[PDB]
Copies of this chain bind each other. A is one copy, B any other.
Amino acid sequence: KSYANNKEKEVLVLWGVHHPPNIGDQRALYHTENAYVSVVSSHYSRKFTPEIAK
């Protein structure tokens, strides 16, 4: 999914990257042990690939 500005003012955006404390959540909710997110812009961009950390 995506968005770009139409308002012509500047924008401030927030998001999160889930780290369960156990795997049974991870398989139950999302059904992949693989994590891969890619939050992308022109200037900034970054990916996220976590595991469970107790």
Contacts and interface: CB of A to CB of B under 8 A. Distances in A.
**Interface SS of chain A: helix, strand, loop or mixed?**
strand
Please tell me how many copies of the chain the complex holds. Answer: 2
A9 B53 CA distance: 25
Interface residues of A, number: 5
Interface string A28-54: 000000000010100001000001010
Nearest to A49: B47
Interface in A1-50: 38, 40, 45
Contacts of A38: 51, 53
B40 A45 contact: no
4 contacts: A38-B51, A38-B53, A40-B53, A45-B53
